[PDB]
Structure 1
Amino acid sequence: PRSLKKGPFIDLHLLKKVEKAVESGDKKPLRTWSRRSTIFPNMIGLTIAVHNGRQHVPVFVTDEMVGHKLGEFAPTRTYRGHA
């Protein structure tokens, strides 16, 4: 995965959106397309509408998910059984 010399990664616009939201206490779901952004502790308690190729999925951040990538919580494929 990403080197430690490098440090974690996040997309800037998402960072500003979340920072502004938390200062404001607006706490409305955030539309975003940044599956590759990493989760930082501050985002706990927020809600992110994450694009899944088709649609933006609601997600409720919690401290456990810290360190994961957002795309990890929005499946892009569908399946229900061949039979």
Structure 2
Amino acid sequence: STDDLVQMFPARARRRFKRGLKRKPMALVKKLRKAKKDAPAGEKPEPVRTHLRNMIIVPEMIGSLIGVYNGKTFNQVEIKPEMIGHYLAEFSISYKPVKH
């Protein structure tokens, strides 16, 4: 039921959907289900290591172990119910905090 979710989502998020998410996010979404099936009964599922950082987290995603690439490392991420509405970008820092 994506349609009532886009109403919950903020304006950037629903505009993103209204443009028709292309092939790569559709190839990524399947692998979360696939990992959940592979995962032993009530166990930590396989890491899903992704290149995409502009995909938005949809309520299906909660439970996946994604490895959002930050340019150099495949930094693994875990999803919580509050992680809804952001991208996988803001969870893999691309830089390092500065200490002079």
TM range (shorter): 0.7 to 0.9
The structure, 1 or 2, with the larger RCO (C-alpha pairs under 8 Å, 6+ apart) is 1
Q: Which residue of 2 aligns with 1:64?
A: 82
What is the CA RMSD across the aligned residues, in angstroms?
2.3
Measure, in 2, the Cα distance between the counterparts of 1:52 and 1:35: 8
* Higher normalized helix content (fraction of residues): 2
Gaps of 5+ in 2: 1-11
- Summarize the alignment of residues 1-83 of structure 1 with structure 2, pairs less than 5 Å apart: 1-2=12-13, 3=15, 6=18, 9=21, 11-25=25-39, 27-81=45-99, 83=100
* Higher normalized strand content (fraction of residues): 1
Instruction: Calculate the TM-score normalised by the size of structure 1.
Output: 0.80
Measure, in 2, the Cα distance between the counterparts of 1:12 and 1:46: 15
User: Match for 1:67: what amino acid?
Assistant: G
Measure, in 1, the Cα distance between the counterparts of 2:51 and 2:80: 19
Instruction: Calculate the TM-score normalised by the size of structure 2.
Output: 0.68
State the Cα deviation string for residues 52-78 of structure 1 (Å, max 9, x = none): 000011111111001110011111112
Provide the aligned length of Structure 1 versus Structure 2. Answer: 82
Gaps of 5+ in 1: none
Q: Is the 8 A contact 1:48 1:60 kept in 2?
A: yes
State the Cα deviation string for residues 9-33 of structure 1 (Å, max 9, x = none): 4711111211222344361111111
Give every structure 1 segment of 4 or more consecutive aligned residues whose post-TM-superposition deviation is greater than 3 Å: 7-10, 23-26
